[PDB]
């Protein structure tokens, strides 16, 4: 089974700072990697699909790139309502596996 | 009006059973890829089960043989039959229309299954 | 060289496979495609097999999925009837086609006869050829 | 050795009949990464006669080679090419990343992603109808809950082994197709146990004095006993 | 009820290849590598071994 590793585990940055987290795959997953935003208590919300494609309605400040085994997720300018836990998942190869998660807090 | 509404969670003794119903609106369940995903308290996300559009069923190793997933076309509802429940099965159980293409990925709100 | 070929089959209307044998003036061609035939398939005055290469006698029969074709050629000076005499027909083709036939048609005077299950006595001379025969029920 | 291969949804079928099949060209080739036979032995195939042999060829991902097998499930086995549980044949595969992947990405190879129900064994679905995934009908127009049922592989050379294109050939064994059945040399003036074209016996083969006809094979004495034979290779009567 | 396991019981084995058929009441427990091809195996498993 594939194993996704997500760095960093936690993170705090000022409003407007560039925020970037990584997600390294144990195997090659092509570009079949999605990104979710889960605000406290609520369900996960899909932001980035297929490594680099932005889901319709997501603000432009959210970015994604990477292929093969190393991927990145970037927030252009961090906003207060961006506080949440962000996960990465691969889905092409079974079983579906998630990342460790990254908690984001405002400074 | 696309949304997933789910219910059926609650307390259950270990080794017991519990079925989770996930009612859909805005699309056909029997024609889509559907998934159950559980999140233990304080932990990350954990994939549970998948049913294809054609009906093929796939399960995770930790619930294989114990959990079952199905659907009802007349009610447009996704089900998750859970048997031989264990203490480590306690989590919030989100049902989600799996992402396959642009903007069809939609998650439920989860129900709290507490095995104690 | 008026007569050219033969069609064998059951319906011969592009519904089932059917043997088509045609000698186009230099080339012998045998096919078993599900041909769509005309009402009167005359020549200008799913295929499972395909092969390409006076008095004439032929014997066509189909036994256990094998289509035996025996033949013999000889000169003749006669118009109004068959010549009287004896001659044997050697085997030329043994098609493994496997298609069962019920009906057939010619493609161009000729003569047609139908076989029956009889017992015969054949005389083989010193050279291995049939020189005379006796019908055991004549 | 074909130059172009078909997409898996529109898999190609070649009907092989009336020929001597030399399977040694295949199982003695070191250029195959997957070669699994079902209900038959690979080396013991040159001794088996069959009525019809079917060779189906297509291109998939290396990840999905495991699905070309009886009783498998997955996006390929369900919706593109399905083998029956009683499959009698062989599955042959090899990597073709050198041929079927372009630098900018090859998009000529496709696979079916959406289908209401699974394919029956040896089913070939080439439909282009828009897949009605929602309550509302599509009317041949794409949009929400209305998706093109096919998806394109992104075959790039930089892909992992599991994502590179693999060319697959499925042989189905269903008599006009037999295996070589080679022969040996013949010796005269010595007691031998012999097996000519359809007959077998024991005896001494000697140069004959008879004149067999061009179509005669087996001699026969007066008392219905084999007397002479025509050697299948050398046009000599023994 | 006795020999099956939820995860699959693989303790029971069967011989899949042999250079010849067994004679009556013959017992073969050898673990020699079967050479399915023309390449000698020399006790090393692999392709056609
Ligand atoms: C039989 O064949 C030989 C030569 O093969 C020939 O000399 C002989 O005349 C033939 N027999 C008859 C009756 O013609
Ligand atoms: C068969 O092949 C051999 C050589 O392999 C050749 O000498 C011989 O003439 C061939 N026979 C026929 C009838 O073609």
Coordinates of C-alpha atoms in Angstrom, one line a residue, chain D residues 26-226:
Chain D
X26 CA 6.6 -16.8 -28.1
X27 CA 7.5 -18.7 -25.0
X28 CA 11.2 -18.7 -26.0
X29 CA 11.2 -14.9 -26.3
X30 CA 12.9 -13.0 -23.5
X31 CA 11.1 -9.7 -24.5
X32 CA 7.9 -10.4 -22.5
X33 CA 7.4 -9.2 -18.9
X34 CA 4.0 -11.0 -18.4
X35 CA 3.2 -14.4 -19.8
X36 CA 0.4 -16.3 -18.0
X37 CA -1.6 -19.1 -19.5
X38 CA -4.9 -20.5 -18.2
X39 CA -6.2 -24.0 -18.8
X40 CA -3.2 -25.0 -21.0
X41 CA 0.6 -25.4 -20.7
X42 CA 2.8 -23.0 -22.7
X43 CA 5.4 -25.6 -23.7
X44 CA 2.7 -28.2 -24.3
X45 CA 0.8 -26.0 -26.8
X46 CA 2.5 -27.2 -30.0
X47 CA 0.9 -30.6 -29.4
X48 CA -2.7 -29.4 -29.1
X49 CA -5.2 -28.8 -31.9
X50 CA -8.0 -26.3 -31.7
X51 CA -10.8 -25.2 -33.9
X52 CA -10.2 -21.4 -33.6
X53 CA -7.7 -19.2 -31.9
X54 CA -8.4 -15.5 -31.1
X55 CA -5.7 -12.9 -30.5
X56 CA -6.9 -9.7 -28.9
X57 CA -4.5 -6.8 -28.6
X58 CA -4.7 -3.4 -26.8
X59 CA -2.7 -1.0 -24.7
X60 CA -3.2 -0.3 -20.9
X61 CA -1.2 0.9 -17.9
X62 CA 1.3 -1.4 -16.2
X63 CA -0.8 -1.0 -13.1
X64 CA -3.7 -2.6 -14.9
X65 CA -2.0 -5.7 -16.3
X66 CA -3.1 -7.6 -13.2
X67 CA -6.7 -7.0 -14.3
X68 CA -6.4 -9.0 -17.5
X69 CA -7.1 -12.3 -15.8
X70 CA -10.2 -14.4 -14.9
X71 CA -12.3 -13.1 -12.0
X72 CA -10.6 -9.7 -11.8
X73 CA -12.3 -6.4 -11.1
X74 CA -11.2 -2.8 -11.8
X75 CA -11.8 0.1 -14.2
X76 CA -10.4 -2.1 -17.0
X77 CA -11.8 -5.5 -16.2
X78 CA -15.3 -4.1 -15.6
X79 CA -15.6 -1.5 -18.4
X80 CA -13.1 -2.3 -21.2
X81 CA -12.0 -6.0 -21.5
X82 CA -13.3 -8.8 -19.3
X83 CA -12.1 -12.4 -19.3
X84 CA -14.4 -15.2 -18.3
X85 CA -13.8 -17.3 -15.2
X86 CA -13.3 -20.3 -17.4
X87 CA -10.8 -18.6 -19.7
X88 CA -8.7 -21.1 -21.8
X89 CA -5.7 -19.2 -23.2
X90 CA -2.7 -17.0 -22.5
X91 CA -2.1 -13.4 -21.5
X92 CA 1.1 -11.8 -22.8
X93 CA 2.3 -8.4 -22.0
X94 CA 5.4 -6.2 -22.4
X95 CA 6.4 -2.6 -21.7
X96 CA 6.1 -0.3 -24.7
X97 CA 7.0 3.1 -23.1
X98 CA 9.6 3.5 -25.9
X99 CA 6.8 3.4 -28.5
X100 CA 3.5 4.5 -27.0
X101 CA 4.6 7.5 -24.9
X102 CA 5.2 11.0 -26.3
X103 CA 7.3 13.7 -24.8
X104 CA 4.4 16.2 -24.5
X105 CA 2.1 13.3 -23.6
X106 CA 0.4 10.7 -25.8
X107 CA -3.4 11.0 -25.8
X108 CA -4.3 8.5 -28.6
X109 CA -4.8 5.6 -26.2
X110 CA -8.1 5.6 -24.3
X111 CA -10.0 3.6 -21.7
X112 CA -13.6 3.5 -20.7
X113 CA -14.2 5.2 -17.3
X114 CA -18.0 5.3 -16.9
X115 CA -20.5 2.4 -17.4
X116 CA -23.7 1.6 -15.7
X117 CA -22.9 -2.2 -15.5
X118 CA -19.9 -4.4 -15.9
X119 CA -18.9 -6.0 -19.3
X120 CA -19.7 -9.6 -20.0
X121 CA -16.7 -11.8 -21.0
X122 CA -15.2 -10.7 -24.4
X123 CA -17.5 -7.6 -24.6
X124 CA -16.4 -4.7 -26.8
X125 CA -18.0 -1.4 -25.9
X126 CA -17.2 1.4 -28.4
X127 CA -20.0 3.8 -27.4
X128 CA -19.4 7.6 -27.3
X129 CA -22.8 8.5 -25.7
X130 CA -22.6 11.0 -22.9
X131 CA -22.8 9.2 -19.5
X132 CA -25.9 10.3 -17.6
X133 CA -24.6 10.4 -14.0
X134 CA -27.4 12.5 -12.6
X135 CA -31.2 12.8 -12.4
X136 CA -31.5 15.0 -15.5
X137 CA -30.9 13.6 -19.0
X138 CA -27.8 14.7 -20.9
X139 CA -29.2 14.9 -24.5
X140 CA -25.7 14.4 -25.9
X141 CA -24.4 17.5 -24.2
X142 CA -21.5 17.5 -21.7
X143 CA -21.8 19.3 -18.3
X144 CA -22.5 18.5 -14.7
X145 CA -23.7 14.9 -14.2
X146 CA -23.1 14.4 -18.0
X147 CA -19.6 13.2 -18.7
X148 CA -17.8 11.8 -21.7
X149 CA -17.5 8.1 -20.8
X150 CA -13.9 7.7 -22.0
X151 CA -10.7 8.9 -20.3
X152 CA -7.3 9.5 -21.9
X153 CA -4.1 7.9 -20.6
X154 CA -1.3 10.4 -20.1
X155 CA 1.6 8.3 -21.4
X156 CA 4.8 10.3 -20.8
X157 CA 8.3 8.8 -20.7
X158 CA 8.9 10.2 -17.2
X159 CA 6.1 8.0 -15.8
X160 CA 6.7 5.2 -13.3
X161 CA 6.7 1.7 -14.5
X162 CA 3.1 1.2 -13.4
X163 CA 2.0 4.2 -15.5
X164 CA 4.0 3.4 -18.7
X165 CA 2.1 1.8 -21.6
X166 CA 2.1 -2.0 -21.9
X167 CA 1.1 -3.8 -25.0
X168 CA -1.1 -6.9 -24.3
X169 CA -2.0 -9.9 -26.5
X170 CA -4.7 -12.3 -25.3
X171 CA -4.7 -15.7 -27.0
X172 CA -8.1 -17.5 -26.7
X173 CA -8.1 -21.2 -27.5
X174 CA -11.5 -22.6 -28.7
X175 CA -9.6 -28.4 -36.0
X176 CA -7.9 -25.9 -38.4
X177 CA -5.1 -24.8 -36.1
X178 CA -2.5 -27.3 -34.9
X179 CA 1.1 -27.2 -33.7
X180 CA 4.2 -28.1 -35.7
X181 CA 4.6 -31.8 -35.1
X182 CA 8.1 -32.1 -36.6
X183 CA 9.6 -35.2 -38.0
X184 CA 13.0 -37.0 -38.1
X185 CA 15.3 -38.9 -40.5
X186 CA 14.3 -42.3 -41.9
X187 CA 16.5 -45.4 -42.1
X188 CA 16.2 -48.4 -44.4
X189 CA 17.1 -52.1 -44.2
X190 CA 16.6 -52.1 -40.4
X191 CA 13.6 -53.1 -38.4
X192 CA 11.9 -49.9 -37.3
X193 CA 8.6 -49.0 -35.6
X194 CA 7.3 -46.3 -37.9
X195 CA 4.4 -43.8 -37.9
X196 CA 3.5 -42.3 -41.3
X197 CA 0.9 -39.6 -41.9
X198 CA -2.0 -41.4 -40.3
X199 CA -0.8 -45.0 -40.0
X200 CA 1.5 -46.8 -37.6
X201 CA 3.3 -50.1 -37.7
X202 CA 6.5 -52.1 -37.3
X203 CA 8.6 -53.3 -40.2
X204 CA 11.5 -52.8 -42.5
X205 CA 11.3 -50.0 -45.1
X206 CA 12.9 -50.8 -48.5
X207 CA 13.3 -49.2 -51.9
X208 CA 10.2 -50.2 -53.8
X209 CA 9.5 -51.2 -57.4
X210 CA 5.9 -49.9 -57.7
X211 CA 4.6 -46.8 -59.4
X212 CA 2.2 -45.0 -57.1
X213 CA -0.1 -42.4 -58.5
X214 CA 0.6 -38.7 -57.6
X215 CA -2.3 -38.8 -55.1
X216 CA -1.9 -42.3 -53.6
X217 CA -0.3 -42.6 -50.1
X218 CA -0.7 -46.0 -48.6
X219 CA -0.4 -49.3 -50.3
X220 CA -2.5 -52.4 -49.6
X221 CA -2.1 -56.1 -50.3
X222 CA -4.9 -58.4 -51.4
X223 CA -5.7 -59.3 -47.7
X224 CA -6.3 -55.8 -46.5
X225 CA -2.8 -55.4 -45.2
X226 CA -0.6 -52.3 -45.6

